[PDB]
Amino acid sequence: GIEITITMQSDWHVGTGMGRGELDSVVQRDGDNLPYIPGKTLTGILRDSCEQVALGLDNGQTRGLWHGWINFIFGDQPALAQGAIEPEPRPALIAIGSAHLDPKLKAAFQGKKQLQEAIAFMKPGVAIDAITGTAKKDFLRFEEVVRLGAKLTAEVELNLPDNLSETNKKVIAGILASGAKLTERLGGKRRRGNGRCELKFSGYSDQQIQWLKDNYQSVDQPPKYQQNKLQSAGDNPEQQPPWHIIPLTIKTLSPVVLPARTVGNVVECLDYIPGRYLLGYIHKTLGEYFDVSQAIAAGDLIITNATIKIDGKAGRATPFCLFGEKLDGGLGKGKGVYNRFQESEPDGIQLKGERGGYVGQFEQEQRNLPNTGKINSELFTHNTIQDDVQRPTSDVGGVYSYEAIIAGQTFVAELRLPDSLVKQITSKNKNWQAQLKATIRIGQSKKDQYGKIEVTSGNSADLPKPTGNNKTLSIWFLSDILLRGDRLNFNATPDDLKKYLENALDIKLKERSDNDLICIALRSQRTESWQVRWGLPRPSLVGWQAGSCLIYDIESGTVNAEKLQELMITGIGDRCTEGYGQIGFNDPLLSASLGKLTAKSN
Amino acid sequence: FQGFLVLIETSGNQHFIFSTNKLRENIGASELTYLATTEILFQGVDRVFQTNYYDQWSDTNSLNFLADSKLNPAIDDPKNNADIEILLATSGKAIALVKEEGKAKQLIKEVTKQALINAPGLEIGGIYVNCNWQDKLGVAKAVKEAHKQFEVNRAKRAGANGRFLRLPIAAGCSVSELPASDFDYNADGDKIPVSTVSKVKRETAKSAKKRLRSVDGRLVNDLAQLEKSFDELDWLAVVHADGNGLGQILLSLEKYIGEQTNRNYIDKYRRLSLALDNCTINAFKMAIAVFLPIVPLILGGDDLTVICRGDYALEFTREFLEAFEGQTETHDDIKVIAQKAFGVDRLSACAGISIIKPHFPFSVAYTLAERLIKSAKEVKQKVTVTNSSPITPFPCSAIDFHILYDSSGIDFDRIREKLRPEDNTELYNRPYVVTAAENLSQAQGYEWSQAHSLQTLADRVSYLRSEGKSALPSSQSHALRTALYLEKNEADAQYSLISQRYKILKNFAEDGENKSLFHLENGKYVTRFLDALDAKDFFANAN
Amino acid sequence: ARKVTTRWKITGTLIAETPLHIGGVGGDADTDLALAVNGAGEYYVPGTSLAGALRGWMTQLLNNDESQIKDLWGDHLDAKRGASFVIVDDAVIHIPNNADVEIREGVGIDRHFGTAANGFKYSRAVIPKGSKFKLPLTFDSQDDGLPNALIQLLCALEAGDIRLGAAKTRGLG
Amino acid sequence: KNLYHYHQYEITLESAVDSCKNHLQAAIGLLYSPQKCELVKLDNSGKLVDSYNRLKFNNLGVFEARFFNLNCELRWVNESNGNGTAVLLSESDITLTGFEKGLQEFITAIDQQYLLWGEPAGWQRLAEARIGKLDIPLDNPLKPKDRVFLTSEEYIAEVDDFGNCAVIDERLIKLEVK
Ligand SMILES: [Mg+2]
Ligand SMILES: [Mg+2]
Ligand SMILES: [Mg+2]
């Protein structure tokens, strides 16, 4: 409900090392291609102004009662620690979004590329040799500055503790009103007049500062931090068929950072939302109706990965049995794609295996290549200022980058619940699927610039119903499969996977013998991830990537489509509740032969 | 005769070597990769077969020894008792012929076990396949069957990621997702945690000295002074260069050996691989004349990548590619196979060249060089052997280069569209052909190659650089530069204000009328003028 | 944050004692050399341009000593220093009533023939004499008192010993 | 060389630890629960002082555990409502009741180290500002410049019939100060 409104009173520059045209440095621009103040700039600037206030109230003591309050509101800075710290770092109470131009003005810009450039102008700069008084060689630059008078507004959230006394609430409001009013400048070249601003909270005024002036001598230490522990009841019904499948549509309202790995100083991003990111929202919304924590432990609940929406459905990870013509083919070209589970390599022309992306739907007489979805992503670069030199330094890292999924992307997950848990809910709330609409924050850096997503629930979809072909069984890994070897570590092998399905389905399987046709097309996967509740990284999870494929000739018995359906719901292997293990049997995209086909302001 | 063909090959090289930004680990990681199929192969062969391949390697410090019939005998015929023959050994790959399955198996065990111990985190495996010599062509079939089945058996194998698994309580590597296990030191001497993987890379950085200093006594002689020296310098350049067509040759080589006999295929196939390796090495030794301030991360086969001094990298790569063509024209063992394959007796390579300010992250700058090489490698479709079918690229060598001038962003797609200002216009001609116009004159796409010839850029740079005062003032070059970002009508308008004041501008025209800096190309308008202004100071040579 | 013993806001009126020209990127169809204007099109002194005029004069005062200048105006190189303690804002120029920007013609006279040289004709927009703008300084003192060199600077401004903008030797600034 | 391993199925963690207690004497343990990851130590009899209420599953309980000492490591993971699989891995052939014995040959075992979180802040305390404290079971006091390494052995064996070697397991041993 809170906003920050920023009125820019001189021309202002922010955010980018890159430079485009005849300008040397270019300003940060949002998804509408309009300039804006990133939420991490806004937090870092506002924190700094609150740090000055607290530093004054402490009579200049750099640690003290009032610096405790800053660490309460804005969270601790680990990596400024100078000695042994035994408590875990506190997160911030205050989340501050990015500040954007007025939405009705932003609509007027749409498509008017020449006007979006005109919001800024080149500012020249020269450096002058002190003895000769003439410009130094090399020392010439031209810089983009955005026109003064821009009025920008940011959403702010204060998720205060459920128990904070009204005296302490007035202290928090006092500091934030104080730090806002002390804030006078932001962005680049502040010390030389760029980026002068008025920063105001909605609903904080001089009354908030005046109360603090009247009362700061009375103020105590902040309350101690406490984790929100889980709480089980153990009261759930037994799981009973059927399984209800509730599609959840996720739409990114700001960039989302979903850490794949760090290489150097750049955090790389996944191109899907793992199901673990949604368990916090499932806990928020359904934990009032049934014991969500017990359901996870019993496996009565699955939230799949969210993959890019194609054909109105979740895009499916591209099967590694597809190979494209290396010269000018593949799904990116829309032609020259061979399903190597069924087609020989053509003579002469060499192929490259498919390695990523998602395909839409395909049917056993598609006459076309399946619709292929792409996920757009952007690189955001940040810095960390050392407070005494007021510039970044090696002692504080100083430069880092996030890849992020940009805004406006749409993803589809599915929550699956057994019939007995939907009965539990519906006995308590008939409209419970209405409570699944939410806006939530997921990811890395979720509390500021990144991570804002809409969730919308669809209507209950039908259970998947694969074809029970007794000739070949074919398995498409729609999600990463984690298996444990018989030593309970993850060093399982594809022969352990044969036994798993063989044992699970009551059939014997053997690799197909056709010398031109590949039978197995896996790649290894390793996931490294934190666990926030533990405060320690998860054990490393090893398995096979989504998109991996294999096909077996059935040696004896008969495969039962009833059991294939059930595995397509609950998945196979470890941690299926996070959407690992999700799998597709006998999908015709593995069965078909593809080489002949082609793709379809105010 | 009957026997087995062993293939041993190293996977994941680009991830293992180029991920970590630390110069010592990239050198160290590349060394462990080279040693795995040479030093460790020959030691592995010697421990299994009781041969002395390692002694000849370490005395000669070169692979040429395994060409010599006394030093690497035929497995076939009774005249020699040898039970092993190395068909090929090279960086990242090795192939051997063995007459017993158990020794074939034991060789692969021996080599891979040593990799697990001495080179943790290196991914290496092998395959052996039945080789039948009563088929006159079975050895060529064995090679292709071995390469085919190796991919399939890689999947049904335990990955290199299946070890060093994180426990929640174990600290992190500083440079990797792996759990820390060891300590090392920052360049400023502060202690840092590292993994066993990064520890062994950093340790092995010294072992690379002995190999490269045999290539030239100047190279990598004191690694810490290279790091110090690079920081003093103004620009670096990550160069990546890659050979064209060898893969299609070697997948089809039965067609070009002449006599359809196993012994000839081995003899030809072995010599070709060694010949390429020498051509790459010889061309590199020629190219360094343009400059010590050059670090080979990879040098071998058809493949080169080095961190050069910047503003010497266009000439080093031009000189390298020209020298590499000249080597492959003169080397007999390539000449006839290339002549039969492509109608001309030479091979070719292309290069991607980042050119970076020295502190900028290497792992990012190398990812550019991987994208620039793909653009330079587009000649492999626009210039082609006439009436070939399926159409084969004609041997042509080309460059693409960048010169970053940025602190963060580095997206080839953003980079190139931000200087493609109008839908009819692009301000770059940058995939430049370095092959001489004489060699290309009988390919399709000849006129395209001439519009893209590097000599057009190198000439234009000389005019900009030519002079007691500039022939074209910088004052005026920057007027043109600004106008190029406008519509072509406005760009031509500004040139027409100038074109008669500076008679040198007749040489920069491209219209054939001396009234536009743009020429039409594939329906687009494109110009060399902005490449010449960019590259003006990155055409320096000790010659 | 940066510790600050006292923040000094140092402000007043600056008057153009001769016509000013702070240049923009240049050219404006009306003149060859064109005045800097802020994003609202108002004429202004960029704080970069004024800050450099002040830092320049102090450097001539302190005999080009770097060591003391960097302690006021900050640095990038030294591990101890970083951001500037003196802050200089942008200041809009208010031209006198009814007055307007003047265009000054210029010519270069060939030293041999005594006549205008070919191409050496130019014109410059100038802010007329008597125009005003705000002095917009802030100083974040970490020590007590006020630096004497910063007091000498303000004395020099009141003496009118500082020149700002272009053509400083040829009438302006 | 044989790495022995013993399997038992449909066993609760409280019951698995009880069955192996003769061999898990002084064993360090690492228990995974939805809320927290706990180090524990068994006494020299091989018992956990509050074993039932610590090792129950039913209410946010432990779902996976590892127990290790010089001679062996026990692993357990849940599979249905608190019934799990026990596997005990040992360098020594040992009698275990009800456990099904097996083994696999290995070519060589190479030692490994994993650095634990943080510097020094019976039981000792490590601390790092990234994570706060970590209390670890370690009898010797720690000097201010020490580190603690968990130590292990990786077991190398042929995986492929083509003779490709790999590590077939890693066994944890003990905490060691370095
Ligand atoms: Mg320069
Ligand atoms: Mg510039
Ligand atoms: Mg003009």
Short mmCIF file of C-alpha atoms in Angstrom, two decimals, chain C:
data_model
loop_
_atom_site.label_atom_id
_atom_site.label_comp_id
_atom_site.label_asym_id
_atom_site.label_seq_id
_atom_site.Cartn_x
_atom_site.Cartn_y
_atom_site.Cartn_z
CA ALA C 1 27.53 5.58 5.39
CA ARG C 2 30.41 7.97 5.01
CA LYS C 3 31.01 9.58 8.38
CA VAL C 4 30.37 13.33 8.31
CA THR C 5 31.27 15.57 11.22
CA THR C 6 29.40 18.48 9.66
CA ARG C 7 27.62 19.24 6.40
CA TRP C 8 28.12 22.80 5.15
CA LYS C 9 25.71 24.30 2.66
CA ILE C 10 27.51 27.15 0.96
CA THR C 11 25.34 29.21 -1.29
CA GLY C 12 24.93 32.64 -2.81
CA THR C 13 24.51 34.41 -6.13
CA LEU C 14 27.04 34.19 -8.94
CA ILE C 15 26.88 37.01 -11.52
CA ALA C 16 28.38 36.96 -15.01
CA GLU C 17 30.93 39.78 -14.99
CA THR C 18 31.50 39.19 -18.71
CA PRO C 19 29.42 37.15 -21.15
CA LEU C 20 29.49 33.40 -20.52
CA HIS C 21 29.59 30.48 -22.86
CA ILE C 22 29.31 26.96 -21.49
CA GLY C 23 29.13 24.76 -24.56
CA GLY C 24 26.82 21.89 -25.29
CA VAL C 25 27.63 19.33 -27.92
CA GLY C 26 27.61 22.18 -30.40
CA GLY C 27 25.83 23.55 -33.43
CA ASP C 28 22.21 24.68 -33.34
CA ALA C 29 21.37 26.07 -36.81
CA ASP C 30 21.31 29.55 -35.28
CA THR C 31 25.02 29.54 -34.37
CA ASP C 32 28.03 27.33 -34.87
CA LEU C 33 28.72 27.13 -31.13
CA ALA C 34 25.68 26.58 -28.94
CA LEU C 35 25.04 27.05 -25.25
CA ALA C 36 24.43 24.19 -22.86
CA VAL C 37 20.78 23.77 -21.92
CA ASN C 38 19.32 21.44 -19.30
CA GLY C 39 16.59 18.91 -20.03
CA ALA C 40 13.94 21.62 -19.76
CA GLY C 41 15.83 23.68 -22.35
CA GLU C 42 16.83 26.24 -19.74
CA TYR C 43 20.34 27.61 -19.89
CA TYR C 44 22.43 26.34 -17.03
CA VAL C 45 25.92 25.87 -15.62
CA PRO C 46 26.58 22.13 -15.38
CA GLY C 47 27.94 21.27 -11.99
CA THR C 48 30.67 19.39 -13.80
CA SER C 49 31.75 22.58 -15.53
CA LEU C 50 31.57 24.70 -12.38
CA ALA C 51 33.13 22.02 -10.20
CA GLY C 52 36.07 21.80 -12.58
CA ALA C 53 36.57 25.57 -12.59
CA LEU C 54 36.76 25.55 -8.80
CA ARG C 55 38.98 22.46 -8.61
CA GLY C 56 41.14 24.03 -11.28
CA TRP C 57 41.68 27.24 -9.36
CA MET C 58 42.50 25.36 -6.15
CA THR C 59 45.07 23.34 -8.08
CA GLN C 60 46.71 26.55 -9.23
CA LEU C 61 46.52 27.82 -5.65
CA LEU C 62 48.00 24.69 -4.09
CA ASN C 63 50.81 24.78 -6.66
CA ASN C 64 49.44 21.72 -8.44
CA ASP C 65 49.81 19.68 -5.26
CA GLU C 66 47.69 16.57 -5.75
CA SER C 67 47.75 15.41 -2.18
CA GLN C 68 45.51 18.09 -0.66
CA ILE C 69 43.28 18.54 -3.72
CA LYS C 70 42.20 14.90 -3.64
CA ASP C 71 41.19 15.29 0.01
CA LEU C 72 38.54 17.85 -0.98
CA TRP C 73 37.55 16.86 -4.49
CA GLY C 74 38.01 13.14 -4.04
CA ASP C 75 39.76 10.60 -6.17
CA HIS C 76 39.33 7.26 -7.92
CA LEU C 77 42.85 5.88 -7.75
CA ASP C 78 43.91 5.91 -4.09
CA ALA C 79 42.48 3.05 -2.04
CA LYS C 80 41.65 5.47 0.79
CA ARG C 81 39.80 8.26 -1.02
CA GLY C 82 37.06 7.79 -3.61
CA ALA C 83 34.07 10.10 -3.68
CA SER C 84 34.21 13.90 -3.56
CA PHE C 85 33.47 15.79 -0.34
CA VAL C 86 32.52 18.97 -2.22
CA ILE C 87 29.20 18.63 -4.06
CA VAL C 88 28.35 21.06 -6.87
CA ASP C 89 24.81 21.11 -8.25
CA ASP C 90 23.57 22.27 -11.63
CA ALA C 91 22.48 25.92 -11.60
CA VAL C 92 20.01 27.48 -14.04
CA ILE C 93 21.04 30.85 -15.48
CA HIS C 94 18.49 33.65 -15.15
CA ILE C 95 19.11 36.20 -17.90
CA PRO C 96 18.18 39.82 -17.10
CA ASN C 97 14.76 41.21 -17.85
CA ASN C 98 14.03 41.65 -21.56
CA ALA C 99 17.61 40.59 -22.30
CA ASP C 100 18.26 37.54 -24.45
CA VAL C 101 21.09 35.32 -25.67
CA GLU C 102 23.43 37.28 -27.93
CA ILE C 103 25.28 35.93 -30.96
CA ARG C 104 28.91 37.00 -31.29
CA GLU C 105 30.41 36.83 -34.78
CA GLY C 106 33.99 35.74 -35.23
CA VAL C 107 36.45 35.77 -38.08
CA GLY C 108 40.05 34.70 -38.58
CA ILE C 109 42.15 37.20 -40.48
CA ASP C 110 44.82 35.85 -42.80
CA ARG C 111 48.14 37.16 -41.56
CA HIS C 112 49.50 37.61 -45.10
CA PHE C 113 46.62 39.28 -46.95
CA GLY C 114 45.09 40.95 -43.93
CA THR C 115 41.64 39.64 -44.80
CA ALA C 116 39.28 36.98 -43.53
CA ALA C 117 40.69 33.50 -43.98
CA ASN C 118 38.65 30.96 -45.91
CA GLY C 119 36.48 28.86 -43.63
CA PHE C 120 37.37 30.89 -40.55
CA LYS C 121 33.95 32.42 -40.01
CA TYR C 122 32.04 31.35 -36.90
CA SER C 123 29.50 32.61 -34.38
CA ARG C 124 28.98 31.99 -30.69
CA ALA C 125 25.92 32.30 -28.49
CA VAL C 126 26.73 34.02 -25.20
CA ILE C 127 24.85 34.67 -21.97
CA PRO C 128 24.81 38.45 -21.51
CA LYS C 129 26.73 40.25 -18.80
CA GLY C 130 24.86 40.56 -15.52
CA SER C 131 23.07 37.23 -15.75
CA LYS C 132 22.76 35.41 -12.43
CA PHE C 133 22.91 31.85 -11.22
CA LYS C 134 22.95 30.22 -7.80
CA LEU C 135 26.16 29.02 -6.20
CA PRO C 136 25.18 25.49 -5.20
CA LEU C 137 27.96 24.00 -3.01
CA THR C 138 27.72 21.43 -0.22
CA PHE C 139 30.72 20.26 1.79
CA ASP C 140 30.78 17.14 4.01
CA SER C 141 33.43 17.77 6.65
CA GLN C 142 34.89 14.74 8.43
CA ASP C 143 37.24 16.93 10.47
CA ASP C 144 36.20 19.90 12.58
CA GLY C 145 36.06 23.44 11.22
CA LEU C 146 36.33 24.32 7.52
CA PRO C 147 39.39 23.76 5.31
CA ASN C 148 41.37 26.92 4.79
CA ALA C 149 41.81 26.12 1.11
CA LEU C 150 38.04 25.97 0.81
CA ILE C 151 37.88 29.37 2.53
CA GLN C 152 40.46 30.70 0.06
CA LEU C 153 38.26 29.40 -2.74
CA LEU C 154 35.24 31.36 -1.52
CA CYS C 155 37.41 34.45 -1.09
CA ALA C 156 38.58 34.00 -4.68
CA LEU C 157 34.99 33.80 -5.94
CA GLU C 158 34.08 36.97 -4.08
CA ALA C 159 37.17 38.60 -5.60
CA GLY C 160 36.02 37.44 -9.05
CA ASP C 161 39.29 35.58 -9.75
CA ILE C 162 37.56 32.51 -11.24
CA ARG C 163 36.60 32.15 -14.91
CA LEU C 164 34.04 29.72 -16.21
CA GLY C 165 33.28 28.32 -19.65
CA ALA C 166 34.81 28.94 -23.07
CA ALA C 167 36.82 31.73 -24.65
CA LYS C 168 38.24 32.69 -21.28
CA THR C 169 41.14 34.61 -22.82
CA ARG C 170 38.95 36.36 -25.41
CA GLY C 171 36.42 38.24 -23.28
CA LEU C 172 34.15 35.62 -21.80
CA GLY C 173 33.66 33.76 -18.60
#
